[PDB]
Amino acid sequence: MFENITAAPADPILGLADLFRADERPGKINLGIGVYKDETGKTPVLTSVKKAEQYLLENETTKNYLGIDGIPEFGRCTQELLFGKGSALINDKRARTAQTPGGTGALRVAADFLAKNTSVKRVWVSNPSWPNHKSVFNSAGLEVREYAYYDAENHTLDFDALINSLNEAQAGDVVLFHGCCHNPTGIDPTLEQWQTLAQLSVEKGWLPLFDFAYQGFARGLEEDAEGLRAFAAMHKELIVASSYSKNFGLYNERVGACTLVAADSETVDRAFSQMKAAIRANYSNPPAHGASVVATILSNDALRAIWEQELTDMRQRIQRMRQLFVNTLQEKGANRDFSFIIKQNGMFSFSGLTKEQVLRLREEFGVYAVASGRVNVAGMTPDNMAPLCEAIVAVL
Amino acid sequence: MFENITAAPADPILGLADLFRADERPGKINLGIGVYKDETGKTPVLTSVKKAEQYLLENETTKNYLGIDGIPEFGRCTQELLFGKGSALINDKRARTAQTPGGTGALRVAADFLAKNTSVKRVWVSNPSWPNHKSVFNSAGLEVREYAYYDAENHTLDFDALINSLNEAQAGDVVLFHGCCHNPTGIDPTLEQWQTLAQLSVEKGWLPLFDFAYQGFARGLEEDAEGLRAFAAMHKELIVASSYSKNFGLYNERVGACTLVAADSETVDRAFSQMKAAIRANYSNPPAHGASVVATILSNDALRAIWEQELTDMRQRIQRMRQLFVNTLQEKGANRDFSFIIKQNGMFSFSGLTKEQVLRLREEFGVYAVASGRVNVAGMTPDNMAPLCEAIVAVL
Ligand SMILES: *Cc1c(COP(=O)(O)O)cnc(C)c1O
């Protein structure tokens, strides 16, 4: 039944790792990773989540099943992080949050729910976007379409092409928005554009799906949700797949949320019964440990203050190398002007390199990066900086 | 898009819990739960997994993503538990194990893989079986069929009806077998029947899917896998969805495995690339904590010996109340003879009651049970025994 021919193909970024370890040579630099790294190259456990883990060891007395939608505490800590404390959405009981395995886990649950209970047939994702978005949505029977976003040239958001392209969408189409700037480009909407897009969607009938995975890495936790909240003000129904992998550095514990908002509490509960039916048929109920850590910190004033200092250090560190890479590039020769790197938010950026400068950089220079030219600046440190900017000047 | 009409319906066992807490009265007894409970009514964390959790707090230094198929250690600890140490299957590199979120998580992954990469269209599950089996398989586009198993009368396995019914299956049909006896009935195959069914399947062309969730609760870890191994000897390809929820009492950490075996290593790796493609499009990669606890204990001789003493206490405790319930039923009046309860393995058993003796037992007697008459004997203790056997004699 399986013997002879089934198939393959390698993940874009995930197969690039098995030639990082294999290289002998001194220099070897991996940008092209997807996690954060500190000035010494490690992805440490946060001081704050180690404290909440000692709390959980001493306090937990059972390991019994969680409800299908998880830990209540977690759900409202999420709603308050995504929307704010005083939001018409929370006091009006318009939102329901399922605790889910990672942000990908939340998108597959948005997907199965939508594919099975709704009339939705296409979702519109940006070009470029995170490659695993097509697979999650195609696995739920939905085909994916693309709306312009960058193209390239000016190194910015091509606002008029995204809209002239978004007009080809009909009214029960989902359009997926990145809340916290864009993987792979780091490019925003400005608040005035998020407002210009929230009205459009209200008038054309799109149903927005915000993918929000890097909240806290652009200007701060609150400022990073103003796009979302600018749409949550205008919408009756919306969906958000949030993740706590990159901000609680809780990557392998699989900690995410799928929030559904619906117009009123009676509707959102009927809808959320089917979202819970979807989940029951996938993994049955969510992993407790990581969500138990996120809810213990977010509800403890001491702990939550150490976490926020730790998110501000990561955030400040990435900003530093955006600032420092574009400077070392100037004082190391540098052909092209890279000023665009600064205010392009978060960990990833398109270096601008061709799919030939990347392979020249990788075969015999030791710098790794994704062939699309996407680099992770959190893979950059101060004493690996000038070996890296030198290698890049060598190829233009 | 969601406002007005979507839908509902309640889970068989999972909705029965919200009227357990709501009852004031003294007596209130919940059988109809799905977890183990000790002689005092609690589902404690195992001594052994608390020790492995202190080890993990002191030792882990990162929380970075696991590969798609998880922790290597976990995978071979599983292969050695499912198949034995010296198995042609392991030394010949014929099996690949993905670490998965719970046993349900492994079945949805068997399902998506099969539905998308294979010609499989129907799977045959027993009547009765675990109700969430139809949903997992239907969500993957597969319809479910049923093979006779119990019907009722003799209170045993109706061997000839299951086979006369299994002949209506064609050759790329999956037939799902419960390895460790049967949810909901606790009824086996004997080893001589598992051998009689392994040949049948080899000759008709079925592809077996073993669901193995209660390994260690019938006679012991090894004896409980002899059905599986009696088929793994005869088969070229097979699938098993194993779970560590009920034996490591690790319920909410979501710890399971999906093992694929294929005829040779080159095939099973091609097949397992697509199984990993399936997983990537669902939750991306599995939760680390619980699997990290299972692999730390199974690879430590001290620790693994405390765990096995703890699995033998649970196993001995359930046997005790099977023994004691059928005795208190004799000395408390008792109409019918309940001798069938003993050697009917594990936690659940069909009490034999009608869907009217259950509702009489629940509305004004305080004993809870699933309407199908399924009881959890681990919900039975020594000083709740004679209140419960008394209530049952009262209704016949
Ligand atoms: C990382 C990421 C996710 C999901 O991350 P998890 O590791 O599953 O929490 C979702 N969307 C985008 C755009 C991401 O970058």
Ligand SMILES: *Cc1c(COP(=O)(O)O)cnc(C)c1O
């Ligand atoms: C409990 C059970 C499972 C899966 O359990 P998890 O809680 O997800 O580990 C699968 N099959 C049967 C027959 C079960 O009883």
